[PDB]
Enzyme design. Sequence first.
Site, PDB file in Angstrom:
ATOM      1  N   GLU A  11      -4.319  -1.029  -7.437  1.00 44.30           N
ATOM      2  CA  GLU A  11      -3.688  -1.027  -6.387  1.00 44.30           C
ATOM      3  C   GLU A  11      -3.618  -2.438  -6.017  1.00 44.30           C
ATOM      4  OE1 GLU A  11      -2.115   0.282  -4.052  1.00 44.30           O
ATOM      5  OE2 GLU A  11      -1.901   2.107  -5.091  1.00 44.30           O
ATOM      6  N   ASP A  20       2.701  -2.527   1.244  1.00 43.82           N
ATOM      7  CA  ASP A  20       2.807  -1.938  -0.356  1.00 43.82           C
ATOM      8  C   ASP A  20       4.280  -1.771  -0.566  1.00 43.82           C
ATOM      9  OD1 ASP A  20       4.001   0.686   1.111  1.00 43.82           O
ATOM     10  OD2 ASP A  20       2.736   1.917   0.644  1.00 43.82           O
ATOM     11  N   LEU A  32      -3.570   2.706   3.351  1.00 43.96           N
ATOM     12  CA  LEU A  32      -2.193   2.434   3.527  1.00 43.96           C
ATOM     13  C   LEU A  32      -2.583   2.642   5.562  1.00 43.96           C
ATOM     14  CD1 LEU A  32       0.464   3.009   4.343  1.00 43.96           C
ATOM     15  CD2 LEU A  32      -0.291   5.754   4.381  1.00 43.96           C
ATOM     16  N   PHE A 104      -3.480  10.005  -4.864  1.00 42.33           N
ATOM     17  CA  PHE A 104      -4.534   8.456  -3.625  1.00 42.33           C
ATOM     18  C   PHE A 104      -2.715   7.678  -3.529  1.00 42.33           C
ATOM     19  CE2 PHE A 104      -6.981   4.988  -2.696  1.00 42.33           C
ATOM     20  CZ  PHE A 104      -6.876   3.966  -2.552  1.00 42.33           C
ATOM     21  N   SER A 117       5.721  19.605 -13.011  1.00 37.44           N
ATOM     22  CA  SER A 117       4.529  18.830 -14.105  1.00 37.44           C
ATOM     23  C   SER A 117       3.351  19.612 -14.291  1.00 37.44           C
ATOM     24  CB  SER A 117       4.184  17.685 -13.818  1.00 37.44           C
ATOM     25  OG  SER A 117       6.069  16.773 -13.718  1.00 37.44           O
TER      26      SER A 117
END
Length: 162
Positions: A11, A20, A32, A104, A117
């Site tokens: 990040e 971002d 955010l 996140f 997945s």
Amino acid sequence: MNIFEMLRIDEGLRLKIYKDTEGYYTIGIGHLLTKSPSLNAAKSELDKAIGRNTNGVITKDEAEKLFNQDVDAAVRGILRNAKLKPVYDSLDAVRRAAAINMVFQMGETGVAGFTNSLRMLQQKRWDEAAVNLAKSRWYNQTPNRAKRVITTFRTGTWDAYK
Ligand SMILES: Clc1ccccc1Cl
């Protein structure tokens, strides 16, 4: 290495409002602020989060305070999500950090597309899971980060982060 160090690498740290990878106003360690195109709206969210009139700038301590809260809330959200909790609980601690990393970045709604997945992850079919994870908008838009997170899921090691 741990989830804090991992996300800090992925990040970065910026003390002024920036956009971002998706063009959204953000501050600190990937905090955010809003998906609104209004900078004034973003500045308001910042002030609300910090508890003072910041004028779009924060300190390192403030950034780290928000980061700790964000990580905490991400993990807690996982545990409160009936589709995420069993998979998360099935994982070792290293792969758990990879799970938190993904939430996140994309939120629980972003993770909703990853049902296939997650099943492979619960099955501990690590190589298959890794292949499935890369078949995503996520991978295409942030390949270098996705590759690191995927390697972590594939191996259960911190090799991709040194
Ligand atoms: Cl919460 C989550 C996100 C991505 C992969 C696995 C899990 Cl448990």
